[PDB]
Amino acid sequence: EIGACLDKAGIQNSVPTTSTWKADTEAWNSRVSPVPSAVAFPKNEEEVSAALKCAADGGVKVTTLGGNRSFSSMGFGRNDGALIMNLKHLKHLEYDASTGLLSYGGPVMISEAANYMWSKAKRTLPHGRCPDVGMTGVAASGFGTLSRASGTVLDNIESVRVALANGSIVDADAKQNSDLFWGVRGAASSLGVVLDFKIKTFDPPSQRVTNYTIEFNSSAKPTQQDNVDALVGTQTWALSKDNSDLLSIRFGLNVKSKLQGFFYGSGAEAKTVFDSLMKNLPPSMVLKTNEYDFWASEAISTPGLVDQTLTPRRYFYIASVTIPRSKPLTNATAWELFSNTAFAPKLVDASASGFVDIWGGKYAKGVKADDSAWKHDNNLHLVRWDMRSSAFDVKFADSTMTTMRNSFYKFVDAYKASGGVPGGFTTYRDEKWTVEEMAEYLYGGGNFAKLQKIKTAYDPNEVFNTDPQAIPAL
């Protein structure tokens, strides 16, 4: 039926009959498998509106595909029976030297954007650390090595061009369709088919880049306390006058934790930075560094960048929260994090691992709660803990993910108990959030109500409600 309306309009489409149905509806997380009603492949903006009319006519719900690297298979549902908007014909990358803006859309990959910007203008741009993530999907937040210095991916979106539920295609930015743009910066999937993003680009912040590892020396016998002190001390440094936003810090959460990242600088500059950080750390930890040119370092931070490499599918689950600078970790809450992650009993049939990405810095201090639908003002930490099996065709029981989830939220609850009001990270959204949880974590500070108001205005028939976490209308 939906497939017949589409065929009527001249729109290339896949339905369960089509010989390529299986390949066209394969999501990245093998644990979450939406069966959609159809996949549309519009060739221009006319076909985008014509496909949405078919869905509106039929009552079919719509979601649109980015790079198909959702940690929770969001791009295909997750509810069954949706129309999938595959924008592969609208793929583009265009750098406007007058504005410094990169314009992009369709299933454009992080690695593709970086290689273009590099060979076009020897420039960089905010991006995550997986090469095959879609730039459109990661603009729901997006944390990279330069984010302490330059903001998240979402923070650098200057405008979008959106196809709406009734076929109108509009431009939105801070000056025009401003409430829709606000909503798109955090709830894009609930609001339109976004056909174009404009992200700000940057000259590399240094010629040379020092990548580093800080870890306990091989003879140290680190306890839980030693690990806590390394985390709290890293926090102390980031909050100190010694802090540099040119230092990315991924704090690997393990019984022998370690810090890894990149300093955008060389020579004595890095040595002064590393020195003030080490002096905040347990005395048994040791620093190791290497030095590369800027572009080579990008292939280190984003492995597989230069060959635009693909990531294997995973039987996967992630839970994540942000720590706002309004409640930094205390030794007690830092302790609860370790007890529930690295020092938790191992999972019977999955590997759990993760890190605290250190956030903070000047840019985040100047993000206001209401700058976007996604509330991300003045964050200090990004906590990620995930589980995976060894192979996409190897599963772990639901009860295993339950156990892991209850442990992580024991930490979150202790953090709350300490006074903290944890936030969320859209690209690391908890697939098991209720709406109550999704609003508190992603859309706090009264953002959610304003979000519903914008939803009710721009999609009142809930065409864009393919997921239990899609924003409901009034």
Ligand X SMILES: *c1c(C)c(C)cc2c1nc1c(=O)[nH]c(=O)nc-1n2C[C@H](O)[C@H](O)[C@H](O)COP(=O)(O)OP(=O)(O)OC[C@H]1O[C@@H](n2cnc3c(N)ncnc32)[C@H](O)[C@@H]1O
Ligand Y SMILES: *[C@H]1O[C@H](CO)[C@@H](O)[C@H](O)[C@@H]1O
Ligand Z SMILES: CC(=O)N[C@@H]1[C@@H](O)[C@H](O)[C@@H](CO)O[C@H]1O
Please give the DSSP secondary-structure letter assigned to residue 402.
H
260 binds ligand X (CB under 6 A): no
Which of ligand Y, ligand X, ligand Z, none is residue 427 near (CB under 5 to 8 Å by kind)? ligand X
56 binds ligand Y (CB under 6 A): no
Residue 406 structure tokens? 């209850």
Quote the crossing angle between the two packed helices 224-238 and 331-340, to the nearest 10°. Answer: 130
Residue 120 structure tokens? 């076009």
73 to 102, contacts with ligand Y by CB under 6 A?
81
- Asked whether the beta carbons of 312 and 392 are under 8 A apart, the reply is yes
Q: Which stretch binds ligand Z (CB under 6 A): 83-91, 331-339, 346-354, 355-363?
A: 331-339
Residue 136 vs 257, nearer CB to ligand X:
136
- Binding site for FAD, by residue number, is 64, 66-71, 75, 129-130, 134, 137, 143, 194, 427
Residue 100 vs 304, nearer CB to ligand Z:
304
For residue 138, count CB atoms less than 10 angstroms from its CB and return exposed for 0-12, middle for 13-18, buried for 19 or more.
Answer: buried
Using the Cα atoms of residue 176, residue 177, residue 183 and residue 186 in order, give the sign of their dihedral: negative
User: Please, where are the H alpha helices in 285-397?
Assistant: 294-301, 331-340, 362-365
Which of ligand X, ligand Z, ligand Y, none is residue 60 near (CB under 5 to 8 Å by kind)? ligand Y
Give me the least distance between CB of 290 and ligand Z, in Å please: 4
- Whole-angstrom distance, CA of residue 285 vs CA of residue 287: 7
Give me the least distance between CB of 2 and ligand Y, in Å please: 5
Residue 15 vs 457, nearer CB to ligand Z:
457
Other residues' Cβ atoms within 10 Å of the Cβ of residue 285: 21
Give me the least distance between CB of 326 and ligand Z, in Å please: 22
320 binds ligand X (CB under 6 A): no
- The region that residue 281 occupies, defined by phi over 0 for left and psi between -120 and 50 for alpha, beta otherwise, is beta
60 binds ligand Y (CB under 6 A): yes
* Amino acid identity for residue 77 in this structure: G
- Whole-angstrom distance, CA of residue 423 vs CA of residue 324: 7
Which of ligand Y, ligand X, ligand Z, none is residue 166 near (CB under 5 to 8 Å by kind)? ligand Z
- Whole-angstrom distance, CA of residue 361 vs CA of residue 344: 31
Q: Using CB under 6 A as the criterion, what x/- string covers residues 207-236 for binding ligand Y?
A: ------------------------------
290 binds ligand Z (CB under 6 A): yes
Residue 222 structure tokens? 């680190």
Measure Cα distances from 198 to 84, 106, 334 in Å.
Answer: 23, 13, 38
Residue 299 structure tokens? 């292939």
75 binds ligand X (CB under 6 A): yes
Q: Using CB under 6 A as the criterion, what x/- string covers residues 419-458 for binding ligand Z?
A: --------------------------------------xx
H or E stretch including 135?
helix 135-138
User: Please, where are the H alpha helices in 209-308?
Assistant: 224-238, 267-279, 294-301
1 binds ligand Y (CB under 6 A): yes
403 to 432, contacts with ligand X by CB under 6 A?
427
Furthest-apart CA pair in the chain: how many Å? Answer: 71
319 binds ligand X (CB under 6 A): no
At 151 the three-state DSSP class reads coil
Pick from 62, 82, 113, 138: which binds ligand X (CB under 6 A)? 138
- Binding site for N-acetyl-D-glucosamine, by residue number, is 166, 168, 211, 213, 290, 457
57 binds ligand Y (CB under 6 A): no
Residue 108 structure tokens? 């454009």
Tell me, by CB under 6 A, how many residues bind ligand Z: 21
Residue 227 structure tokens? 């690990």
Which of ligand X, ligand Y, ligand Z, none is residue 37 near (CB under 5 to 8 Å by kind)? ligand Y
Q: Which stretch binds ligand X (CB under 6 A): 33-41, 70-78, 175-183, 408-416?
A: 70-78
Which of ligand Z, ligand Y, ligand X, none is residue 212 near (CB under 5 to 8 Å by kind)? ligand Z
- Asked whether the beta carbons of 327 and 136 are under 8 A apart, the reply is no
* Contacts to ligand X by CB under 6 A: 28, 63-71, 74-75, 128-130, 133-134, 136-138, 140-143, 188-189, 193-194, 311, 427
* Contacts to ligand Y by CB under 6 A: 1-2, 37, 60, 81
